[PDB]
């Protein structure tokens, strides 16, 4: 839906009912650990300041306003414009160090008509270089995820560093963690989509790093709050010193988090996940170290893509070698009920399933954790209704309404008709999804995730549905031996 | 084929006839701008040295040999093993700075049983925002070429190399300079293409795993290892993953003949595949320091990512362009009158759709041309040949090969793309492309460029998959405008 006006333009209260619609990109204020100016793209006339900017740079409130950047930044003003040519993206950032009244770090980016400048204080090197090689030589996605979080924590000294991976449905999961000895084990925890809303996700896809240095600090407004050019909200979406959403700063406080920081991992223009960081006390990470994190953000964006592709390939291999061992016994031997229900074949483990139903020559027969006998009959009745020679679902209760009661033993379904109709068929079953534990916050969020996944099960990997289809073909080929 | 033994084990001469089989990974020697040691994976006993190593570190020839790394590197020896656990890949590299008799930069990697250590002098250099800004520039570049320019430009600004080129491989393993950044007053290599054999198999393969190698002085003498063989196995010490590995003699010739004193190249890898190189040249010898090489290595991988992004974005907007064009064709196809009138209209630009030099149309028994097309009697003979072919779609980069008797009509129409509108090839439509041609600006590039053109004799610009895809979708939609004409 269309986001509401900001609080400073008669906008409504950002409650937990409508926070999907917070204009997080135009808070009209910054964090107090730095300063911020805006200026005309062409003229270089300074138009807005953060109130602290006067004190932070070492000049006076209305002497800066209505002044050329040519004057303020004689060395940088020309080189700045070379780096940020008119009409360039807002994602593009030029950086430089300065001398005043101390050493400052200037970070500039352009929002079409308006230049936006961020000032904050500034000032062995093989930590990154070695980590780069470590990431690359890690054997799988988990191992990569561990090296990432471990490294980031070693570099930053954050209390908690987690790699937070998004799922198809926009829900999150902590797949690796690195924390200080004596802390909550967030590893494994999953959280709903709404905990990181649309506009937040969208913004994190273009601008790949944002932080909250002090979760208790007061925001520093811009003066004037609006851009004199257009009389419009100044978009700070691509500014590191942008004021964090009040609603989120609550979440952080309730976790006892003083400082936060997150780095986007993007794969194929898609927000794959975050390196989320926490400190229980406020902590301003210096610009040169943030830069080091930014490199990892993108080195990881690459290796994530490589390792997932390598992992799926070796997983696909495993299913194909398994599929062969099945077809070996299928051409061979005797009745299928005898052969396929053999533990040596492990026909369950093929589709990492909790239960398995087989019907052959009119008889049905089970293996593993399967619903009560009368229900199994009613299920095979329902299967005969369905078109095609393949069915699947993460939550059977939804697709088969009258089979909602048999969710605990068999929430997930994967079915294949061997011959025609569903007379000769084969059916896998998965339990209702279940995870362990270790209002506003994670304890409530974790519970509301489990509520959303009520009656749902572990979803089927495409390669499992693909190999299941190839098994329909090869197992049809061992019916003339039995007919 | 199986590579020959190295020169130092009675191996044959690496001539230009058999250089595909040079064991480039085991030269048994290093470059003189650094030093090199090998040691036991478990014990840390030093087994081999480069002859200069004694002088370079500040100890004596046979005092180092048969010594623990625990003694030599008390601070590093433990942390080293933590970073390089037994059985880890040879691609994995641990780095650290030292103090002796000066500041050294140690770079270690493991080849299973054997640890290999590289020493070379170091420093802080340059300030640090050059990379950080370049990272953002690459990302915000609008297309592959623009990205390529920013890369080469940046690399040159950082290194001060005389020439920096982004060298992109093609499907057939041939190369092409797609961007260049050189010093004012130099050979314009931009555009030049070179054959596959100029960078052979084992070279390519090695450059896919170890993503950077250099030649600091093209005239310098190699420094051998003593002993040349590994005492463990009595085997060639593989230096493939060592920066100070001695460059192939055969390649150092190539560089000398171009007047290149120093070379350096960084692999760009996309999907486990060697996409291309950032190739650098200096006309005088030039040792690039380790901390600056590291900066180049980051770009090597930032670029590996953006190349993949920008190519995917470029193909997507190109695919869009063909689809909007395809629509404008089908708009006039349902409409109007005879197809010969409609399709041969310049406003439609049925040529430009498939970026073709010539175009043949046949409809209701008559054939009709547009643009640069072979002589009339040949066109008849071509349509005869087309009727032989199965399916409703033909393609080729070099028609002369697939249609032997049509080899003579290569200059006007080397490339072919055909689609039968109805059935058979009675009602059909055929695009033609000229023989591939590029401009100019023994052993070296001048000969290589010419031998590339020789290999591409009778060949044409190949058809983008999306052009062959949209051509197939045009068969369907244009069949749908035949009941209007029948
Ligand atoms: C209904 C609105 C809600 C609010 C929305 C919201 N959230 C963010 C930014 C983040 N929210 C996150 C959620 C988590 N962080 C964690 O550490 C954990 C568990 C350990 C969870 C579930 C995260 C990770 C971020 C990233 C930012 C950061 O880590 O510092 C925003 C936008 C913040 C901004 O950029 O200004 C918004 C609007 N959060 C909710 O949970 C609901 C109630
Ligand atoms: C028959 C053997 C040949 C020899 C093979 C060869 N080449 C290399 C390394 C390279 N060769 C390259 C060829 C070019 N470099 C250029 O700059 C241009 C045009 C401007 C061409 C055509 C390139 C780019 C490399 C990369 C290395 C580098 O740039 O420094 C090796 C192995 C080198 C090593 O790592 O030891 C070998 C064996 N070159 C030939 O042309 C043929 C005759």
GROMACS .gro file of N, CA, C and O in nm, chain A residues 7-8 22-33 36 118 203-204 210-214 217-222 234-249:
model
  180
    7UNK      N    1   0.585   1.165   1.009
    7UNK     CA    2   0.530   1.221   1.133
    7UNK      C    3   0.531   1.374   1.131
    7UNK      O    4   0.436   1.437   1.178
    8UNK      N    5   0.636   1.433   1.073
    8UNK     CA    6   0.652   1.579   1.068
    8UNK      C    7   0.569   1.651   0.960
    8UNK      O    8   0.586   1.772   0.941
   22UNK      N    9   0.545   0.289   0.683
   22UNK     CA   10   0.625   0.397   0.739
   22UNK      C   11   0.721   0.448   0.631
   22UNK      O   12   0.791   0.368   0.569
   23UNK      N   13   0.724   0.580   0.609
   23UNK     CA   14   0.822   0.636   0.517
   23UNK      C   15   0.960   0.640   0.580
   23UNK      O   16   1.008   0.748   0.619
   24UNK      N   17   1.025   0.524   0.589
   24UNK     CA   18   1.153   0.512   0.660
   24UNK      C   19   1.267   0.590   0.593
   24UNK      O   20   1.367   0.622   0.658
   25UNK      N   21   1.250   0.619   0.465
   25UNK     CA   22   1.351   0.688   0.384
   25UNK      C   23   1.353   0.841   0.402
   25UNK      O   24   1.450   0.907   0.361
   26UNK      N   25   1.248   0.897   0.461
   26UNK     CA   26   1.241   1.042   0.485
   26UNK      C   27   1.205   1.076   0.630
   26UNK      O   28   1.100   1.134   0.658
   27UNK      N   29   1.295   1.041   0.724
   27UNK     CA   30   1.272   1.075   0.863
   27UNK      C   31   1.294   1.223   0.893
   27UNK      O   32   1.260   1.270   1.001
   28UNK      N   33   1.352   1.297   0.798
   28UNK     CA   34   1.380   1.439   0.818
   28UNK      C   35   1.474   1.465   0.935
   28UNK      O   36   1.470   1.572   0.995
   29UNK      N   37   1.560   1.368   0.965
   29UNK     CA   38   1.653   1.378   1.077
   29UNK      C   39   1.765   1.274   1.068
   29UNK      O   40   1.750   1.173   1.001
   30UNK      N   41   1.876   1.300   1.136
   30UNK     CA   42   1.991   1.210   1.134
   30UNK      C   43   2.030   1.164   1.275
   30UNK      O   44   1.974   1.209   1.374
   31UNK      N   45   2.127   1.074   1.282
   31UNK     CA   46   2.182   1.029   1.410
   31UNK      C   47   2.289   1.129   1.456
   31UNK      O   48   2.357   1.190   1.374
   32UNK      N   49   2.305   1.145   1.588
   32UNK     CA   50   2.393   1.249   1.642
   32UNK      C   51   2.544   1.222   1.633
   32UNK      O   52   2.623   1.313   1.662
   33UNK      N   53   2.585   1.101   1.594
   33UNK     CA   54   2.729   1.069   1.586
   33UNK      C   55   2.798   1.127   1.461
   33UNK      O   56   2.919   1.109   1.443
   36UNK      N   57   2.526   1.635   0.867
   36UNK     CA   58   2.476   1.621   0.730
   36UNK      C   59   2.437   1.754   0.665
   36UNK      O   60   2.373   1.838   0.727
  118UNK      N   61   2.767   1.366   0.399
  118UNK     CA   62   2.770   1.309   0.533
  118UNK      C   63   2.909   1.326   0.594
  118UNK      O   64   3.008   1.277   0.540
  203UNK      N   65   1.464  -0.096   0.025
  203UNK     CA   66   1.572  -0.002   0.050
  203UNK      C   67   1.706  -0.073   0.073
  203UNK      O   68   1.810  -0.026   0.028
  204UNK      N   69   1.703  -0.185   0.144
  204UNK     CA   70   1.825  -0.261   0.174
  204UNK      C   71   1.881  -0.333   0.051
  204UNK      O   72   1.994  -0.383   0.056
  210UNK      N   73   2.332  -0.019   0.655
  210UNK     CA   74   2.273   0.082   0.743
  210UNK      C   75   2.298   0.043   0.887
  210UNK      O   76   2.315  -0.075   0.916
  211UNK      N   77   2.304   0.142   0.975
  211UNK     CA   78   2.334   0.118   1.116
  211UNK      C   79   2.249   0.204   1.210
  211UNK      O   80   2.185   0.300   1.167
  212UNK      N   81   2.251   0.165   1.337
  212UNK     CA   82   2.192   0.242   1.446
  212UNK      C   83   2.294   0.242   1.560
  212UNK      O   84   2.308   0.143   1.631
  213UNK      N   85   2.366   0.353   1.575
  213UNK     CA   86   2.481   0.358   1.665
  213UNK      C   87   2.441   0.361   1.811
  213UNK      O   88   2.508   0.303   1.897
  214UNK      N   89   2.332   0.432   1.840
  214UNK     CA   90   2.275   0.436   1.975
  214UNK      C   91   2.123   0.423   1.966
  214UNK      O   92   2.057   0.511   1.910
  217UNK      N   93   1.943   0.715   2.161
  217UNK     CA   94   1.975   0.854   2.126
  217UNK      C   95   1.860   0.929   2.062
  217UNK      O   96   1.771   0.870   2.002
  218UNK      N   97   1.864   1.061   2.073
  218UNK     CA   98   1.764   1.147   2.011
  218UNK      C   99   1.806   1.184   1.869
  218UNK      O  100   1.924   1.211   1.844
  219UNK      N  101   1.709   1.186   1.778
  219UNK     CA  102   1.735   1.222   1.638
  219UNK      C  103   1.763   1.373   1.624
  219UNK      O  104   1.707   1.454   1.697
  220UNK      N  105   1.851   1.408   1.531
  220UNK     CA  106   1.888   1.547   1.504
  220UNK      C  107   1.818   1.593   1.376
  220UNK      O  108   1.850   1.544   1.268
  221UNK      N  109   1.721   1.686   1.387
  221UNK     CA  110   1.646   1.727   1.268
  221UNK      C  111   1.727   1.810   1.167
  221UNK      O  112   1.830   1.869   1.203
  222UNK      N  113   1.679   1.813   1.043
  222UNK     CA  114   1.735   1.898   0.938
  222UNK      C  115   1.662   2.032   0.934
  222UNK      O  116   1.540   2.037   0.950
  234UNK      N  117   1.332   1.548   0.205
  234UNK     CA  118   1.467   1.513   0.165
  234UNK      C  119   1.490   1.363   0.186
  234UNK      O  120   1.494   1.317   0.301
  235UNK      N  121   1.506   1.286   0.077
  235UNK     CA  122   1.524   1.142   0.091
  235UNK      C  123   1.665   1.106   0.139
  235UNK      O  124   1.764   1.132   0.070
  236UNK      N  125   1.672   1.048   0.258
  236UNK     CA  126   1.798   1.009   0.319
  236UNK      C  127   1.823   0.859   0.307
  236UNK      O  128   1.918   0.807   0.367
  237UNK      N  129   1.739   0.790   0.229
  237UNK     CA  130   1.750   0.645   0.212
  237UNK      C  131   1.892   0.595   0.191
  237UNK      O  132   1.930   0.491   0.244
  238UNK      N  133   1.969   0.671   0.112
  238UNK     CA  134   2.107   0.633   0.080
  238UNK      C  135   2.212   0.703   0.164
  238UNK      O  136   2.326   0.717   0.121
  239UNK      N  137   2.173   0.747   0.283
  239UNK     CA  138   2.263   0.811   0.378
  239UNK      C  139   2.278   0.723   0.501
  239UNK      O  140   2.179   0.685   0.563
  240UNK      N  141   2.403   0.691   0.537
  240UNK     CA  142   2.433   0.605   0.652
  240UNK      C  143   2.382   0.668   0.782
  240UNK      O  144   2.333   0.597   0.869
  241UNK      N  145   2.391   0.800   0.793
  241UNK     CA  146   2.346   0.873   0.913
  241UNK      C  147   2.195   0.897   0.917
  241UNK      O  148   2.148   0.976   0.998
  242UNK      N  149   2.119   0.832   0.830
  242UNK     CA  150   1.974   0.842   0.833
  242UNK      C  151   1.922   0.795   0.968
  242UNK      O  152   1.971   0.695   1.023
  243UNK      N  153   1.824   0.867   1.022
  243UNK     CA  154   1.760   0.826   1.147
  243UNK      C  155   1.681   0.695   1.129
  243UNK      O  156   1.592   0.685   1.042
  244UNK      N  157   1.716   0.596   1.211
  244UNK     CA  158   1.648   0.467   1.210
  244UNK      C  159   1.502   0.481   1.252
  244UNK      O  160   1.466   0.571   1.329
  245UNK      N  161   1.417   0.394   1.200
  245UNK     CA  162   1.275   0.394   1.234
  245UNK      C  163   1.255   0.380   1.385
  245UNK      O  164   1.314   0.291   1.447
  246UNK      N  165   1.174   0.468   1.445
  246UNK     CA  166   1.139   0.456   1.587
  246UNK      C  167   1.084   0.319   1.624
  246UNK      O  168   1.121   0.264   1.728
  247UNK      N  169   0.998   0.265   1.538
  247UNK     CA  170   0.934   0.136   1.565
  247UNK      C  171   1.037   0.024   1.575
  247UNK      O  172   1.022  -0.067   1.656
  248UNK      N  173   1.142   0.032   1.494
  248UNK     CA  174   1.248  -0.069   1.498
  248UNK      C  175   1.342  -0.049   1.618
  248UNK      O  176   1.390  -0.146   1.678
  249UNK      N  177   1.369   0.076   1.651
  249UNK     CA  178   1.455   0.106   1.765
  249UNK      C  179   1.396   0.052   1.896
  249UNK      O  180   1.470   0.020   1.989
   0.00000   0.00000   0.00000
